[PDB]
Scaffold this active site. Structure first.
Site, PDB file in Angstrom:
ATOM      1  CB  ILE A   8      -1.175   0.036   1.069  1.00  0.00           C
ATOM      2  CG1 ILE A   8      -0.632   0.051   2.483  1.00  0.00           C
ATOM      3  CG2 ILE A   8      -2.163  -1.104   0.778  1.00  0.00           C
ATOM      4  CD1 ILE A   8      -1.716   0.097   3.571  1.00  0.00           C
ATOM      5  N   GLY A   9       2.061   1.278   0.407  1.00  0.00           N
ATOM      6  CA  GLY A   9       2.835   2.536   0.443  1.00  0.00           C
ATOM      7  C   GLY A   9       4.277   2.319   0.847  1.00  0.00           C
ATOM      8  N   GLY A  11       6.870   4.204   3.512  1.00  0.00           N
ATOM      9  CA  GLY A  11       7.028   5.125   4.637  1.00  0.00           C
ATOM     10  C   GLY A  11       8.397   5.739   4.515  1.00  0.00           C
ATOM     11  CE1 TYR A  13      10.035   7.087  10.426  1.00  0.00           C
ATOM     12  CE2 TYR A  13      12.452   7.203  10.143  1.00  0.00           C
ATOM     13  CZ  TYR A  13      11.252   7.771  10.588  1.00  0.00           C
ATOM     14  OH  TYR A  13      11.302   9.028  11.172  1.00  0.00           O
ATOM     15  CE  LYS A  31       6.183   3.456   8.392  1.00  0.00           C
ATOM     16  NZ  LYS A  31       7.508   4.105   7.714  1.00  0.00           N
ATOM     17  CG  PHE A  71      -6.364  -1.020   6.173  1.00  0.00           C
ATOM     18  CD1 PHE A  71      -7.643  -0.857   5.592  1.00  0.00           C
ATOM     19  CD2 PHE A  71      -5.234  -0.938   5.353  1.00  0.00           C
ATOM     20  CE1 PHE A  71      -7.780  -0.661   4.183  1.00  0.00           C
ATOM     21  CE2 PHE A  71      -5.347  -0.768   3.937  1.00  0.00           C
ATOM     22  CZ  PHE A  71      -6.610  -0.615   3.344  1.00  0.00           C
ATOM     23  CG  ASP A 116       8.073  14.216   8.205  1.00  0.00           C
ATOM     24  OD1 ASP A 116       8.033  15.367   7.624  1.00  0.00           O
ATOM     25  OD2 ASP A 116       8.302  13.150   7.598  1.00  0.00           O
ATOM     26  CE  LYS A 118       5.924  12.452   5.024  1.00  0.00           C
ATOM     27  NZ  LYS A 118       7.463  12.547   4.959  1.00  0.00           N
ATOM     28  N   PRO A 119       0.459  15.692   4.167  1.00  0.00           N
ATOM     29  CG  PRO A 119      -0.513  17.105   2.521  1.00  0.00           C
ATOM     30  CD  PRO A 119       0.834  16.799   3.240  1.00  0.00           C
TER      31      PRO A 119
HETATM   32  C1  LIG Z   1       0.878   2.089   8.287  1.00  0.00           C
HETATM   33  C2  LIG Z   1      -0.459   2.758   8.648  1.00  0.00           C
HETATM   34  C3  LIG Z   1      -0.070   4.189   9.108  1.00  0.00           C
HETATM   35  C4  LIG Z   1      -1.485   2.812   7.540  1.00  0.00           C
HETATM   36  C5  LIG Z   1      -2.840   2.529   7.780  1.00  0.00           C
HETATM   37  N1  LIG Z   1      -3.488   2.663   6.586  1.00  0.00           N
HETATM   38  N2  LIG Z   1      -2.519   3.041   5.667  1.00  0.00           N
HETATM   39  C6  LIG Z   1      -2.749   3.390   4.362  1.00  0.00           C
HETATM   40  N3  LIG Z   1      -3.979   3.284   3.871  1.00  0.00           N
HETATM   41  C7  LIG Z   1      -4.391   4.099   2.726  1.00  0.00           C
HETATM   42  C8  LIG Z   1      -4.306   3.218   1.511  1.00  0.00           C
HETATM   43  C9  LIG Z   1      -5.041   2.019   1.454  1.00  0.00           C
HETATM   44  C10 LIG Z   1      -4.960   1.172   0.349  1.00  0.00           C
HETATM   45  C11 LIG Z   1      -4.143   1.571  -0.719  1.00  0.00           C
HETATM   46  C12 LIG Z   1      -3.408   2.776  -0.647  1.00  0.00           C
HETATM   47  C13 LIG Z   1      -3.486   3.603   0.460  1.00  0.00           C
HETATM   48  C14 LIG Z   1      -1.654   3.801   3.561  1.00  0.00           C
HETATM   49  C15 LIG Z   1      -0.383   3.894   4.164  1.00  0.00           C
HETATM   50  N4  LIG Z   1       0.727   4.279   3.435  1.00  0.00           N
HETATM   51  C16 LIG Z   1       2.077   4.298   3.968  1.00  0.00           C
HETATM   52  C17 LIG Z   1       2.136   5.594   4.760  1.00  0.00           C
HETATM   53  C18 LIG Z   1       2.218   5.318   6.282  1.00  0.00           C
HETATM   54  C19 LIG Z   1       2.417   6.637   7.039  1.00  0.00           C
HETATM   55  N5  LIG Z   1       3.290   7.595   6.395  1.00  0.00           N
HETATM   56  C20 LIG Z   1       3.099   7.927   4.976  1.00  0.00           C
HETATM   57  C21 LIG Z   1       3.088   6.623   4.178  1.00  0.00           C
HETATM   58  O1  LIG Z   1       2.513   6.883   2.917  1.00  0.00           O
HETATM   59  N6  LIG Z   1      -0.238   3.563   5.475  1.00  0.00           N
HETATM   60  C22 LIG Z   1      -1.323   3.179   6.194  1.00  0.00           C
END
Ligand SMILES: CC(C)c1cnn2c(NCc3ccccc3)cc(NC[C@H]3CCNC[C@@H]3O)nc12
EC number: 2.7.11.22
Length: 287
Positions: A8-9, A11, A13, A31, A71, A116, A118-119
């Site tokens: 999904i992303g 971070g 780290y 994570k 999530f 930190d 941010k959107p």
């Molecule tokens: C690790 C936790 C903070 C977390 C919970 N839901 N979620 C979603 N959900 C949004 C999403 C769902 C499905 C597909 C894409 C994005 C996306 C995401 N992306 C990684 C992030 C974590 C925090 N910092 C910025 C990063 O983009 N981190 C997280």
């Protein structure tokens, strides 16, 4: 213990997957990061608030630290991109700001900073809630210049006292970032989109005026302050964040005070007349 569902992303780290707990059935964001850090991060399991993404578990194994989070189905950056053509309606902006200030007020009352914001760190659900991700992680690991994938860590939301070399960040740094985010939701453009520390600082100076001892006592003594900084005049907020109303502009002004001692607190911001008619609208989401 965890079946990865999808990536999904990325971070600062480490990589983040949507995952399913194999024995509880729970869907989680997992994570994965490749021991003061472990203690500090373990403590965050107790820093629970409805506007803070829940840290479910910390698992240290095999030279890897897994953080298991609640999530959420979308982030604000994606929401903002998706609403680029009419903008986020003001009532929802106000609801979001109000809920993020509650999250800040909560963590700051416990002397935890984000540092930190941010959107990308603001996640939303279908219930009209917005939550802060990664609280406490910067104190545990530092904020690096690049992420684990080499991506540049954005400067756009960084408070001026950080850019000028102050080593002892206060809770005011989060209020600065959140005011930059507020301006960006309203105008649909980054307020200070710097691409270097000096460009970030000159973008701030060009809008808010170059700071001096009059607005910010002690500023000329900061480590990275130079007498040779150009001396720019401040502009009116009326020009910076149209069509934000007088209450919103007055709150945004107080969130962007140079002097961190004078910058409004999250708690005082919650009482600002801007929030007199705040509601909880439910956004439209395409999942
Ligand atoms: C690790 C936790 C903070 C977390 C919970 N839901 N979620 C979603 N959900 C949004 C999403 C769902 C499905 C597909 C894409 C994005 C996306 C995401 N992306 C990684 C992030 C974590 C925090 N910092 C910025 C990063 O983009 N981190 C997280």
């Amino acid at each position: 213990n965890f079946q990865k569902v999808e990536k999904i992303g990325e971070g600062t780290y480490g990589v983040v997957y949507k995952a399913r707990n194999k024995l509880t059935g729970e869907v989680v964001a997992l994570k994965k990061i490749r021991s003061t850090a472990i203690r500090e991060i373990s403590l965050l399991k107790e820093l629970n608030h409805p506007n803070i993404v829940k840290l479910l578990d910390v698992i240290h194994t095999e030279n890897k630290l897994y953080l298991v989070f609640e999530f959420l189905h979308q982030d604000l950056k994606k929401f903002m991109d998706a609403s680029a053509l009419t903008g986020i309606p003001l009532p929802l902006i106000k609801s979001y700001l109000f809920q993020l200030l509650q999250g800040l007020a909560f963590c700051h009352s416990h002397r935890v900073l984000h540092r930190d914001l941010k959107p990308q760190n603001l996640l939303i659900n279908t219930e009209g809630a917005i939550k802060l991700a990664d609280f406490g992680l910067a104190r545990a690991f530092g904020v690096p210049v690049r992420t684990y994938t080499h991506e540049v860590v954005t400067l756009w939301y960084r408070a001026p006292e950080i850019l000028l070399g102050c080593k002892y960040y206060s809770t005011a740094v989060d209020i600065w970032s959140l005011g930059c985010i507020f301006a960006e939701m309203v105008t649909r453009r980054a307020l200070f989109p710097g691409d270097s520390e000096i460009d970030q600082l000159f973008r701030i100076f060009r809008t808010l005026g170059t700071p001096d001892e009059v607005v910010w006592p002690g500023v000329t003594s900061m480590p990275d302050y130079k007498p040779s900084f150009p001396k720019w005049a401040r502009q009116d907020f009326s020009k910076v964040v149209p069509p934000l109303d007088e209450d919103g502009r007055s709150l945004l002004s107080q969130m962007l005070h140079y002097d961190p001692n004078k910058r409004i607190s999250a708690k005082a911001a919650l009482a600002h007349p801007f929030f007199q008619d705040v509601t909880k609208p439910v956004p439209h989401l395409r999942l």
